[PDB]
Ligand binder design. Structure first.
Ligand code: HEM
Ligand code: HEM
Lengths: 448, 441
């Protein structure tokens, strides 16, 4: 009846218990002590963290709870605007863009992005093929190079050329610095340079994207990217198209929502494979059996079943956008025991949900891809790395097609060594990633 | 590509090879002679018995094969209905009951059943503590008294009081007579009367519970309160009754058989008994075992897995091909063709376990992670695997642990193993003498 809550320390409330730069991991330990639900207060706010499948199934009821824009999302909204990720469900542009963009993110639509994803995936393989004997790979760095370039090419036919550079394209440098500033604002005279840089970074981003939109309208070119689709699509509901300003925000939004979530997933998957050589072997065996052509076809990517299972299991242990926020649309009672008032906030703690022992068995820390051999049997709302319902990840199919393709090619072309015996260090920002994860690859010398 | 087949008897096909009191043991000898797959036919039917991990791993692929209701399961369905064990995976009540009952069978849920399991376990140990010096124990008989009573208390808070009688409670008599009849079919008046004794009692307990409004720690409470997350519907009262009958039918003899075979292997291997008794003495430091103490009985758990490796008490399960497919690159099958997994023979696969497969060595389970996928399958497979796996193991670990703490055992008759076959396996006539260590209980 009364909601569990950690010890409060006078006016600091529960704040002294989260003195870390890894709040999700610390929250997971509080959940281990207090259970499926706890309230957490700090001087400014009140939130409630949910961890069990039984209560998350209720939180995922869209007639009762809707997506809440957390303080992180409101800060990201300063450059992501009313793009899909940082808009409220009730905003007109949320619904218009959702309806217009769904068909361009479907599984069927991946067939059209496939050649551009293969283009960047070949650049990564060649990079690693061309390393001399004494070098090594920086995993999350290379994966981020890949996902940024893939989203840029597939999103608006623009090449950041990240594998040609030490220093990223100026757009990228400004987007990542703006994102970093947005997240750093959470924990805050001498912030005047921060502010001016943020405004400069926003201007860099808007100018380039507005310029690419204007160039495309002026040429009439039609391409296999999302920009063509947004320029020509009309919302079936209102009959209206997106305006140019919103199309820019969607472009920025695809990059910010997709770049690190997807690179983190590839990095965590490669981490789990090198730490479990028998799993790596089974995945590599499938890659060799399936990828018989010089470059993978769309159909071959879809037959990489075990590779997909490895990605799902990496997502189960370390979902790379680890928490999403919801608000009660109306007064309601959660689980028959906890009364909530209209507007009360809930946080879904995804990694902890994914460790619910009543669903997955007592062995939740083990890396076992076989858990996903029959997806249809997993209980409803037990596995939620893509968020929920109409506010779920629109990029799901794109992220999985990209990651499946890339990991399959990695496993086909190289043998991997965890030459430093890397100790997992999970950095938390908007996303999760195995910071400093490094490997050596040994070419299998299989021609592209 | 050509599949072996044992002797045929004209129009009787292979049928007469199973007109024996021990058909699974006869099938194992045929597997010994014919290898990893053989065709077995009867008048209106065909099945293929599989024995190797290589072929059984493919049979366990749920995109290709699903559970088949064997003839034994269809006969058991006369009294178990559309409860979980005797339903097709595609029947609406299978998915509904599965979704609702899963969380009440997890390892976590054993925490809420532990006190009632302890109640019945203490009754068993107390019975043995009270035997005079001139007496012995009838092992499978006492293990069946314990598992029936535990499943009755944890399933629907009802006491069969099997340790208070020579002749079982009437429900038990009708259940075991009803099951024997269904197995002998592989009578009719009595069979209908035994079904009615079962339904009457179980329907009345359900009706009494709904009337009182009482909430217990049993499976009935969970079933009365649960709603299937997919449809939002609850199970109706008729299906709840079939689930209760089902828990008793599917869990009583398989679990008591496990406990009987484990004690058998321990008295036949004194060094293994002594290592298990030393763990039980170290871990079970209180007069009443706690849930956490049971979980620390790791070698006892290994002893139980090894007993299940040699004589898995539900020794065969049946599958059907979902679509046309080729098994092991050599054996083409058609949609609906049936496979039988011969578990005891799978568990004797020398390519997995080494050449010493007949030895009782609990240390094979030291590291569960090294066992190859689908090599060890006493609980069936996938979403149609035993839902009671955690309940059976918690009960057996708890009770074996207590047995080993409180008594020393003597195989006073130098018992010769005789495996009786019904729906399940057991060591018929296994008897022992237990001398108390006089440790508070
Ligand atoms: C494995 C990689 C990914 C993960 C784990 C992930 C996760 C998520 C999550 C959890 C949400 C919901 C956030 C919330 O409720 O506040 C979300 C929303 C979203 N994601 Fe992803 N994402 C991934 C990849 C991508 C990619 C590649 C794209 C674009 C190319 C993308 C674009 C979006 C968008 C636009 C939204 C907002 C959808 C809406 O509300 O209409 N994501 N993502
Ligand atoms: C050590 C003892 C046990 C063994 C060896 C065992 C074995 C099995 C096997 C092999 C199956 C699959 C049958 C098939 O594929 O046709 C099964 C299913 C089942 N068992 Fe167990 N069992 C044991 C104890 C229990 C207990 C104690 C319960 C109940 C409390 C139970 C309830 C069930 C149920 C309900 C099913 C059907 C589940 C479904 O298909 O949804 N079993 N068991």
């Amino acid at each position: 009846k009364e909601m569990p809550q950690p010890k409060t320390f006078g006016e600091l409330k529960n704040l002294p218990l989260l003195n870390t730069d890894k709040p999700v991991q610390a929250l997971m330990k509080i959940a281990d002590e207090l259970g499926e639900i706890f309230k957490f207060e700090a001087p400014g706010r009140v939130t409630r963290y949910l961890s069990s499948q039984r209560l998350i199934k209720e939180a995922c009821d869209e007639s009762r709870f809707d997506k809440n824009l957390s303080q992180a999302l409101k800060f990201v909204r300063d450059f992501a605007g009313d793009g899909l990720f940082t808009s409220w469900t009730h905003e007109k542009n949320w619904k218009k863009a959702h309806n217009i963009l769904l068909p361009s993110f479907s599984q069927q639509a991946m067939k059209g992005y496939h050649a551009m994803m293969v283009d960047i995936a070949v650049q990564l393989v060649q990079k690693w093929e061309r390393l001399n004997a004494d070098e090594h790979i920086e995993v999350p760095e290379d994966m981020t190079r890949l996902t940024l370039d893939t989203i840029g090419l597939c999103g608006f036919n623009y090449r950041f050329n990240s594998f040609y550079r030490d220093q990223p394209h100026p757009f990228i440098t400004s987007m990542v610095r703006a994102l970093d500033e947005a997240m750093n604002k959470l924990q805050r005279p001498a912030y005047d340079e921060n502010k001016r840089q943020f405004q400069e970074d926003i201007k860099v981003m808007n100018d380039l994207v507005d310029k690419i939109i204007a160039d495309r309208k002026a040429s009439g070119e039609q391409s296999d990217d999302l920009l063509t689709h947004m320029l020509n699509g009309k919302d079936p509901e209102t009959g209206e198209p997106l305006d140019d300003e919103n199309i820019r925000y969607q472009i920025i939004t695809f990059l910010i929502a997709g770049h690190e979530t997807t690179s983190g997933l590839l990095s965590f998957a490669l981490y789990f494979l090198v730490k479990n050589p028998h799993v790596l072997q089974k995945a590599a065996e499938e890659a060799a059996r399936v990828l018989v052509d010089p470059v993978p076809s769309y159909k071959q990517v879809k037959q990489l079943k075990y590779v997909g299972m490895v990605l799902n299991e990496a997502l189960r242990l370390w979902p790379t956008a680890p928490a999403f926020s919801l608000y009660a649309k109306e007064d309601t009672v959660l689980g028959g025991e906890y009364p909530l008032e209209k507007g009360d906030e809930l946080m879904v703690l995804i990694p902890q949900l994914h460790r619910d022992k009543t669903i997955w068995g007592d062995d939740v820390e083990e890396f076992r891809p076989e858990r996903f051999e029959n997806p249809s049997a997993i209980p409803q709302h037990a596995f939620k790395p893509w968020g929920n319902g109409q506010r779920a990840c629109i990029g799901q199919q794109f992220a999985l097609h990209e990651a499946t393709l890339v990991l399959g090619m990695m496993l086909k072309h190289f043998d991997f060594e965890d030459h430093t015996n890397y100790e997992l260090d999970i950095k938390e920002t908007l996303t999760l990633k195995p910071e400093g994860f490094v490997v050596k690859a040994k070419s299998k010398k299989i021609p592209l």
